[PDB]
Amino acid sequence: TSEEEEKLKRDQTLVSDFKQQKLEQEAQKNWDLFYKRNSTNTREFEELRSCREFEDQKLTMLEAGCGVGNCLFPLLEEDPNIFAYACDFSPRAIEYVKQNPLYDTERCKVFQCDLTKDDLLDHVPPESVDVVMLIFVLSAVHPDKMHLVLQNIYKVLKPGKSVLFRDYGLYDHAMLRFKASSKLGENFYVRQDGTRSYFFTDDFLAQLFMDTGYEEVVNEYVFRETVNLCVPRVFLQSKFLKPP
Ligand SMILES: C[S@@+](CC[C@H](N)C(=O)[O-])C[C@H]1O[C@@H](n2cnc3c(N)ncnc32)[C@H](O)[C@@H]1O
Numbered sequence: 001t002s003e004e005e006e007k008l009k010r011d012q013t014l015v016s017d018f019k020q021q022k023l024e025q026e027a028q029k030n031w032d033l034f035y036k037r038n039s040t041n042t043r044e045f046e047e048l049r050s051c052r053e054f055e056d057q058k059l060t061m062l063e064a065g066c067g068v069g070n071c072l073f074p075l076l077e078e079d080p081n082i083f084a085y086a087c088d089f090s091p092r093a094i095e096y097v098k099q100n101p102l103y104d105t106e107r108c109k110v111f112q113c114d115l116t117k118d119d120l121l122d123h124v125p126p127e128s129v130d131v132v133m134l135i136f137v138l139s140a141v142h143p144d145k146m147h148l149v150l151q152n153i154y155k156v157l158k159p160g161k162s163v164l165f166r167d168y169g170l171y172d173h174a175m176l177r178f179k180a181s182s183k184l185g186e187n188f189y190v191r192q193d194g195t196r197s198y199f200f201t202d203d204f205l206a207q208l209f210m211d212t213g214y215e216e217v218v219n220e221y222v223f224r225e226t227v228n229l230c231v232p233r234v235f236l237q238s239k240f241l242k243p244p
Helices: 003-025 027-035 043-048 073-078 091-099 146-156 202-211
Strands: 059-064 082-088 108-112 129-135 157-168 183-185 188-190 196-198 215-227 230-241
Touching: 003 027, 003 183, 027 091, 043 073, 043 129, 043 157, 059 146, 073 082, 082 091, 091 108, 129 146, 146 157, 146 202, 157 196, 157 202, 202 215, 202 230
Parallel strands: 059 082, 059 129, 082 108, 129 157
Antiparallel strands: 157 230, 183 188, 188 196, 215 230
16 A cells, blocks of 8 residues: 555544534534424324323323424324423424424423433433333434433333334435445434434344343334335334333
């Protein structure tokens, strides 16, 4: 190898770490910019009706990474005996959740929170929650910090109740198009809008949850289609239990 060949490889590491840190430093900005630049923004129901002891028993629920509430307001409208804590670290997204007319404070408490560093106990009482919902959120978090998210959620969960996980899986469509310029690491990619996407394997995700004290209930790939002309989709869909 040349002298410039050797130089270029140490340059690649250096620039790539610069890129990674900038992307991590601005995780919140890029998600906030995402919301400020757009507005065209069932397994869950089954498990809510599952842990109920009575028939119409009230349950309390934490939607971690609520966005503008696409997975929140439906669950509130179908089920009347459910209270949802909701957080997100994008202020603009929070405005949207507080701003649409379905928002009723007898049913829904939304707050800002960076799940990697802000204590959920600041706004969610300890071991108070029956279901936490991590839907397409963990994959936005740096793989090295994902366990922080799971540790944080742990404090909030009533023992014997569970996290409902769903996120991008191995060989999902986006992973199969990113130019290697956008690869940040193994299964870790950056989108054009600066937000990041991790593509989970069943084994890696299971290890994350067990390293932070959960037990595997369900951990399976699920496959779906999107219309263009059909696009194959791979999600990882799981359920992890906080032990009693
Ligand atoms: C693709 S949206 C998913 C929203 C929602 N779970 C749903 O079902 O539609 C990803 C959301 O995760 C949020 N997010 C990413 N990292 C976060 C973090 N560290 N703490 C809190 N929210 C985060 C972003 O603000 C964004 O709104």
